């Protein structure tokens, strides 16, 4: 993965869709490690859904925001298997 990073279709809309269920798993199988996921500054929906998302399946560790929050609110710091 390019930096561990998983970023909103809303704004963007170029693959981006779906890709944390997916990195889920597969990070986890393959290794132990650490997103951030990057969900809009514009919107707070898809970020908010990825809060939802990640509740509902066990794949995770832990997540939390990125304390830039207050300046970007883009940005949520998610650990897989820590």
Request: glycine share 2%; no cysteine; aromatic share 12%.
């Given at each position: 993965?390019?930096?561990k990073?998983?970023?909103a279709k809303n704004?963007?809309?170029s693959d981006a869709k779906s890709v944390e269920l997916?990195?889920?798993y597969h990070e986890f199988s393959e290794d132990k490690r650490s997103?951030?996921?990057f969900a809009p500054t514009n919107a707070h929906k898809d970020m908010?859904?990825?809060v939802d998302f990640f509740k509902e399946k066990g794949h995770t560790a832990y997540l939390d925001e990125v304390r830039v929050?207050?300046?970007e609110k883009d940005f949520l710091y998610?650990?897989?298997i820590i």
């Amino acid at each position: 993965s390019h930096m561990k990073l998983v970023l909103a279709k809303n704004t963007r809309k170029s693959d981006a869709k779906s890709v944390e269920l997916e990195d889920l798993y597969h990070e986890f199988s393959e290794d132990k490690r650490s997103i951030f996921y990057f969900a809009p500054t514009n919107a707070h929906k898809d970020m908010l859904k990825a809060v939802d998302f990640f509740k509902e399946k066990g794949h995770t560790a832990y997540l939390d925001e990125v304390r830039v929050s207050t300046d970007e609110k883009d940005f949520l710091y998610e650990l897989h298997i820590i």
